[PDB]
Amino acid sequence: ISYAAYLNVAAQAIRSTELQTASVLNRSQTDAFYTQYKNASEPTPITK
């Protein structure tokens, strides 16, 4: 876990009383699949 990942997890936790706007909610959870590659060859996508 990277330093900014460390901060990230904290920020996400920090978004907990409710009052939480959409931009907060998007900033808290996002969907993406990092597609790792080798040389062409592709270790198949897995959620970021």
Partner: protein, 120 residues
């Protein structure tokens, strides 16, 4: 002049007294302070412009007095009132999360946040 900024907001982008929670404990900047680079830990932050005082709850970030008297504070999220009961509910969950569980480390971060909440 103080700079306080978030990715999604800008808060103060000097300002009389700023009290900051850092790797080096807590650091205070008042007028000119000598130039520092300090990583801000998960935090409770106070900014005072005159006697008027504003209290911020901060997710950690970076602090840098620039040698041109620009206190660059950058952090992911700052109002302390907004953060403040739902968080208590979460804290129960976070204890549960530590029990089962990088996920272990994440739950440890949740414990750090739990401490950070206790200050509030």
């Amino acid at each position: 002049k103080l700079q306080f900024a978030l990715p999604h907001e800008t808060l103060y982008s000097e300002v009389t007294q700023v009290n900051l929670p850092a790797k080096s404990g807590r650091i205070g900047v008042l007028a000119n302070h000598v130039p520092t680079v300090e990583q801000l830990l998960p935090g409770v932050v106070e900014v005072m412009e005159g006697s008027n005082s504003k209290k911020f709850f901060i997710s950690g970030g970076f602090a840098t007095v620039q040698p041109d008297s620009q206190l660059c504070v950058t952090a992911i999220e700052a109002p302390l009132e907004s953060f403040s009961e739902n968080i208590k509910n979460l804290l129960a969950e976070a204890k549960k999360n530590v029990s089962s569980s990088r996920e272990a480390a994440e739950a440890a971060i949740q414990v750090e946040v739990l401490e950070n909440l206790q200050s509030v």
